[PDB]
Amino acid sequence: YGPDQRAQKKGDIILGGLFPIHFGVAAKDQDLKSRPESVECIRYNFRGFRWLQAMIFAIEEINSSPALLPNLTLGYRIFDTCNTVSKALEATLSFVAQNKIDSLNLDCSEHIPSTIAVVGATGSGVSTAVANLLGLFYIPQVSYASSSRLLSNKNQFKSFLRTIPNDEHQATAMADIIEYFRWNWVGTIAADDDYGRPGIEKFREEAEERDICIDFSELISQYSDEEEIQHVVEVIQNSTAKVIVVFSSGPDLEPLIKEIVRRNITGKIWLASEAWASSSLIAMPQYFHVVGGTIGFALKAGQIPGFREFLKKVHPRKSVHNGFAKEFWEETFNCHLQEGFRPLCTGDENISSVETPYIDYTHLRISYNVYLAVYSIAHALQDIYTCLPGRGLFTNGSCADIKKVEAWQVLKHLRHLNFTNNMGEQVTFDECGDLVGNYSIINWHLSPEDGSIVFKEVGYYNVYAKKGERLFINEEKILWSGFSREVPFSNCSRDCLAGTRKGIIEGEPTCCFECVECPDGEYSDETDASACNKCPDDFWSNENHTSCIAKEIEFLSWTEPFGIALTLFAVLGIFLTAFVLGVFIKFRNTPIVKATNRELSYLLLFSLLCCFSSSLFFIGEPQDWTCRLRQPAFGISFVLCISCILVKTNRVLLVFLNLQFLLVFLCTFMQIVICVIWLYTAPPSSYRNQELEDEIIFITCHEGSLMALGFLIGYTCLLAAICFFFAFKSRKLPENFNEAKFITFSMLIFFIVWISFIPAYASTYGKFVSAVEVIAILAASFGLLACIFFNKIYIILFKPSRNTIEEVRCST
C-alpha cells in the first residue's frame, strides 16, 4: 500500500508525517541497460528518529487525556524521505490515494483510509514538491523545519503552514552582526537549493544597504564533484577576506569542510545558519583546528515534561507499531537480529551505554516544533468538536460534523487558530501561515573534560523590538578560533589617519583605497577623509594640516620696546626746543637776541617743534588719515624751517611788515599748493597685503601718484641746496659769532643724513622700513637745532655772559 518500512497505528482519525531517518540515497549511476530498481538509503540519522518519536509521544499523550478530543482516537502513517524528493513523492502519492480516485473517475479495494493532515518535511525543496501535490486536495501540511521564503506565496501553496520562522530575519541579523564588529570585507557560500539562494540574496540586499563589500560568492552541493570543490577552495584561498557567511546544511557542507581540513586552512571566521550550527557532522573534534570559534544561530528551546523516559523505553520487540526500531537497534549496538562481521543482538542491552545523538541532547528545538505541529491539528479538531449551531465558520453559521470530517474544514479552522501551549504562550498563524520567535546566538568552544565541542550562548536576537535595537552580544564570552580574545581585523584596507585622505580610486570596489596627503593651504582632522577642506580667510593651515590657525599682522607698534625707545628721542627734542625758547623769551632785549631778528627765531623754533612732532605719524598701525598726512607734515615743516634759515642771514636778503617775512610765506605756500593738489587729485591710502608671505599680513600705505611725491622732496632739497650755496660763500666773514659756518655745517648734516638714508630704505623688510624714516627725521632735526642755537645759548647762559654779550662784541 506504499513504502514497506513505516510506522502506523489505526484509529478514528489518521494523521500523516514525513521525517528524515537517513541522510541520503546511494550514489549510483543508472546506465539503463536493464530495468531500473529502487535505491537504497545509506547513513542512519538519530536526530531524525528522535523527531519521529516526538510525534508518537504527542499523539499518545492526546489519546490519554479526556480534556482534548473525548471519545475519539488518533492514528498515524509515518514514512521516511531520505532527504530526497522521489521517496517523499512516493509517500505522498499514498497519502492522496482515496482523494485522487474520486477526481479521476477510476471507480478498487474501497477500504482506503483518509489522511486529513500531514506534519510536513524538513528541507525546503521536499516541502515544495509535497505541497504542490497536497494543494490539489486542500490537505493541510504543517511543516516543522522548512523555512524558505518561497513557501510564503499563498497563490501557489494554498494549504501550507509552519511552526518555524522564515529566513528574512536571520539574514538581517547576520547583517547586524557584521555591522556590529565593524567589518567590510566578507565572502559568502550557499547551498544550491531553495534554502541557500534566497538567504544569500536577502543577505546581499541587506549588506549592500549598509556599505559592506562582498569579495566572493559560490554555490555548493552534496553531489558536487571534486573539480568544483577544488575550484571553490582556490577561490577561498585567493582572497584576503577572513569572514565567511554560510547558508547550507550539514550534508551540503561536509565535502567542502573535509577538503578545507585536508589542506589545513586556519584563520577564517565562519558565520553559520540555523541548519548547520548544531550539526554533528561538522561539530567534530578533528575539525576544530579549522572550524573553531564559529558564531551561529539557534532556535528557542522547549519543555516536553515526559519525553526522555519515553525515549529510553524503546525496544526492538515491544515496538510493534514502529517499523524503524529494528534498524535503530542494529546501528546503535552494531549487531544483527535473527529474522523471525556482525554478532547476534540480544534483547538485554542498555540504551545509555552508547553515545549517540538520540539521548545526548541538552535542549529541544525542532522536537518542540513537532510537538506544537501535532497540537495545532488537535486543537483545530477540538474547535470543530465544541461548536454550537448558528456560530460556525461557514455560510449560515453552520457547523461541520465530527463524525464526517473533510480536510478543507480542518484547513479552515487552522486558518483561524489561537491556542495557548504548555508554557502559557499563544500560538497563532499569520495571513501567510507563519509563526514568529526569537533567536539565540551561540559560539563553538572546546570541552576541557572529553574534548568535544560545546555550544555556549553569547547573545540573542529579539525579533519583537524596533529596527536597530534587536541584537544583543556579550563580547567577554567569545573565543575567536577557540582562543584569541582580540577581535580580528577583516576589512580590506587600513584607515588613513589625520592629515591624509582616501584619495585614489583604483578600479577595485569602494572598500579598497589608498592614503594621500593634503595640500599646503587646507586642513583635515578625521579618520577616512575623502577631501581636504580650505581654511577661512585670514587663516593659514597648521603644520601637519590637522587644524587651521590665525595669521600674524606685522607693523611698527607703540608698545614694543623699539617704539618706546623711539618715542623718547622725539619727546626729548620737544623739551630741548622748549628750553631754547624759554631762554630766548626770558633773556630778550639783550644784544645777542636783539642783534638778529627776534621774530624770525620764534618762527624757527615753532617749526622745529613741528619737525620733531612730524615723526610720530610713522609710528603705529597705518590707517587712512595717518597716511594722507604723513608726507605733507614733513614737507611743510621742513620747507618752513629751511626758509627761516635761508632768509635770516641778512647778507643777501635785504641788500639784494617786513620784506623778510614775505620770503617765507611764498616758499611755504608753493609747497601747500602741491600738498592740496596731491590730496585732491590722487590721495594716498592704506593696504593690507599678503603677497610676500602666506603667514604674515603686512599693513603698508600706497602713496598714489609718484610725481607729487617727487616734487615734495625735490623742492625741499632745492631750497636746502640754495641755502648751502649762499652760506658757503660767507664762512670766513665774522658776524654774529661766525653764523654762516654753523649754517653751512647744518646744511651739510642734512645732506649727509639724506645720502645715508637712501641706501637703508631699499634694503630693509617690513616693520623696519618705518624704522629708518624716524631716525632720518630725528637726525636732521637735531642737526638743524644744535649748530644754530647751542653756541649762542652757551654765551647767553653760562660764564661767558660776563663780557662776551655786549653791543661792542658780535660786530666783528
Ligand X SMILES: *[C@@H]1O[C@H](CO)[C@@H](O)[C@H](O)[C@H]1NC(C)=O
Ligand Y SMILES: CC(C)(Cc1ccc2ccccc2c1)NC[C@@H](O)COc1cccc(Cl)c1C#N
Ligand Z SMILES: *[C@@H]1O[C@H](CO)[C@@H](O[C@@H]2O[C@H](CO)[C@@H](O)[C@H](O)[C@H]2NC(C)=O)[C@H](O)[C@H]1NC(C)=O
CB of 30 to a second copy, least distance (A): 7
d(C-alpha 637, C-alpha 627), whole Å: 16
DSSP per-residue string spanning 484-517: --SPPP-SSSPPP-TTEE-----SS-TT----EE
Residue 507 counted as an annotated binding residue: yes
Q: Who contacts 270 (Cβ-Cβ below 8 Å, separation ≥6)? A: 244, 246, 291, 294, 295
d(C-alpha 109, C-alpha 35), whole Å: 28
Residue 494 counted as an annotated binding residue: no
The single residue listed with the C-alpha cell 552541493 is 221
Among 210, 263, 289, 312, binds ligand X (CB under 6 A): 289
Instruction: Judge whether 99 and 32 are in contact, CB under 8 Å.
Output: no
DSSP per-residue string spanning 6-61: -EEE--SEEEEEEE-SBS-B-------SS------B-SB-HHHHHHHHHHHHHHHH
CB of 171 to a second copy, least distance (A): 16
Indicate whether 213 belongs to the interface with Ca ion (CB under 5 A). Answer: no
Residue 438 binds which one of ligand X, Ca ion, a second copy, none, with CB within 5 to 8 A depending on kind?
A: ligand X
Residue 50 counted as an annotated binding residue: yes
Residue 471 counted as an annotated binding residue: no
d(C-alpha 516, C-alpha 529), whole Å: 10
Residue 565 binds which one of ligand Z, ligand Y, a second copy, none, with CB within 5 to 8 A depending on kind?
A: none
Indicate whether 138 belongs to the interface with a second copy (CB under 8 A). Answer: yes
Instruction: Judge whether 588 and 598 are in contact, CB under 8 Å.
Output: yes
Region of 23-31, 354-362, 382-390, 603-611 interacting with a second copy (CB under 8 A): 23-31
Q: What pairing do the DSSP bridges indicate for beta strands 13-19 and 74-80?
A: parallel
Among 147, 491, 614, 643, binds ligand X (CB under 6 A): 491
Indicate whether 263 belongs to the interface with ligand X (CB under 6 A). Answer: no
d(C-alpha 634, C-alpha 716), whole Å: 10
Indicate whether 644 belongs to the interface with Ca ion (CB under 5 A). Answer: no
Among 758, 765, 768, 800, binds a second copy (CB under 8 A): 758
Amino acid at 281: L
Residue 776 binds which one of ligand Z, ligand Y, a second copy, none, with CB within 5 to 8 A depending on kind?
A: ligand Y
- The residue among 220 and 743 lying less far from ligand Y, judged by its C-beta, is 743
Among 147, 222, 490, 744, binds ligand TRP (CB under 6 A): 147
d(C-alpha 421, C-alpha 304), whole Å: 11
Among 15, 69, 121, 785, binds Ca ion (CB under 5 A): 69
DSSP per-residue string spanning 761-801: HTS--TTTSTTHHHHTHHHHHHHHHHHHHHHHHHHHHSGGG
d(C-alpha 173, C-alpha 203), whole Å: 9
d(C-alpha 580, C-alpha 786), whole Å: 10
CB of 492 to ligand Z, least distance (A): 8
Residue 493 counted as an annotated binding residue: no
Residue 489 binds which one of ligand Z, ligand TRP, ligand Y, none, with CB within 5 to 8 A depending on kind?
A: ligand Z
Give the three-state DSSP class for 187: strand
The single residue listed with the C-alpha cell 480542518 is 410
Residue 249 counted as an annotated binding residue: no
Indicate whether 104 belongs to the interface with a second copy (CB under 8 A). Answer: yes
d(C-alpha 16, C-alpha 5), whole Å: 14
Residue 439 counted as an annotated binding residue: yes
Site map (CB under 6 A) of ligand Y, residues 676-715, x = contact: -------------------------------------x--
Among 95, 157, 160, 195, binds ligand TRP (CB under 6 A): 195
**Cα radius of gyration (the chain):** 56
Site for ligand Z in 197-236 (CB under 6 A): 211
Residue 145 binds which one of ligand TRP, a second copy, ligand X, none, with CB within 5 to 8 A depending on kind?
A: ligand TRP
- The residue among 190 and 378 lying less far from Ca ion, judged by its C-beta, is 378
Whether the CA torsion 429, 433, 439, 444 is positive or negative: it is positive
d(C-alpha 750, C-alpha 743), whole Å: 11
Residues in the interface with ligand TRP (CB under 6 A) total: 14
Residues in the interface with ligand Z (CB under 6 A) total: 7
Bridge partners (DSSP) of residue 500 are 517
Q: What pairing do the DSSP bridges indicate for beta strands 213-220 and 185-191?
A: parallel
Binding site for Ca ion (CB under 5 A): 69
Binding site for ligand X (CB under 6 A): 182, 184, 234-235, 238, 264, 266, 289, 418, 426, 428, 437-438, 460, 462, 464, 489, 491, 494-495, 528
Binding site for ligand Y (CB under 6 A): 634, 713, 750, 753-754, 757-758, 761, 773, 776-777, 780
Task: Output the known binding site for spermine.
Answer: 215, 217
Binding site for a second copy (CB under 8 A): 1-2, 29-36, 85-86, 89-90, 93-94, 97, 100, 103-109, 129, 132-133, 135-136, 138, 154-156, 158, 197, 201, 205, 211, 217, 223, 393-395, 398, 406, 408, 411-412, 415, 502-510, 513, 516, 519, 530-531, 755, 758-759, 762-763
Task: Output the known binding site for phosphate.
Answer: 47-51, 365-367
